[PDB]
Amino acid sequence: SMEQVAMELRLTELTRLLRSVLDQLQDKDPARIFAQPVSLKEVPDYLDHIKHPMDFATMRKRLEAQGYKNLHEFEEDFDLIIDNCMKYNARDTVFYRAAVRLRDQGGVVLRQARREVDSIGLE
Ligand SMILES: Nc1n[nH]cc1-c1ccc(Br)cc1
């Protein structure tokens, strides 16, 4: 149907916007602490602590499959990256501190992303 095509165009547009947002957010992680999944070989007990692991590579996989239907779903995954890290790692660690900085700097980006999604009507 034409309606289905239009819906798919909207999703493709959202995906383009979220790709830009994801690039901007990952730039706020210059240490690449959040670039890849926590290794279950190097941290074998990780899943005892963290029930829903997340990282930028995994987000990017879902993104390119057009797997984010709206900004909320994307933000959920970004918050998992931050929140998982701030639970597993103590306050005095380079990991926890990196998550705080990513959260703070990323908030700015996500604030305008929300305005843009609403403005252009992408969801
Ligand atoms: N990036 C993370 N999110 N949750 C835990 C971690 C982590 C834990 C140990 C090391 Br070593 C590195 C990273």
From Swiss-Prot:
It is found in: Nucleus; Chromosome. Highly expressed in testis. Residues 9-113 form the Bromo domain. There is a cross-link at residue 41 (Glycyl lysine isopeptide (Lys-Gly) (interchain with G-Cter in SUMO2)). Component of some HBO1 complex composed of KAT7/HBO1, MEAF6, ING4 and BRD1/BRPF2. Component of the MOZ/MORF complex composed at least of ING5, KAT6A, KAT6B, MEAF6 and one of BRPF1, BRD1/BRPF2 and BRPF3. Interacts (via PHD-type zinc finger domain) with unmodified histone H3. Interacts (via PWWP domain) with dimethylated and trimethylated 'Lys-79' on histone H3. Scaffold subunit of various histone acetyltransferase (HAT) complexes, such as the MOZ/MORF and HBO1 complexes, that acts as a regulator of hematopoiesis. Plays a key role in HBO1 complex by directing KAT7/HBO1 specificity towards histone H3 'Lys-14' acetylation (H3K14ac), thereby promoting erythroid differentiation. This is Bromodomain-containing protein 1. It comes from Homo sapiens. The chain holds residues 555 to 676 of 1058 of the full protein.
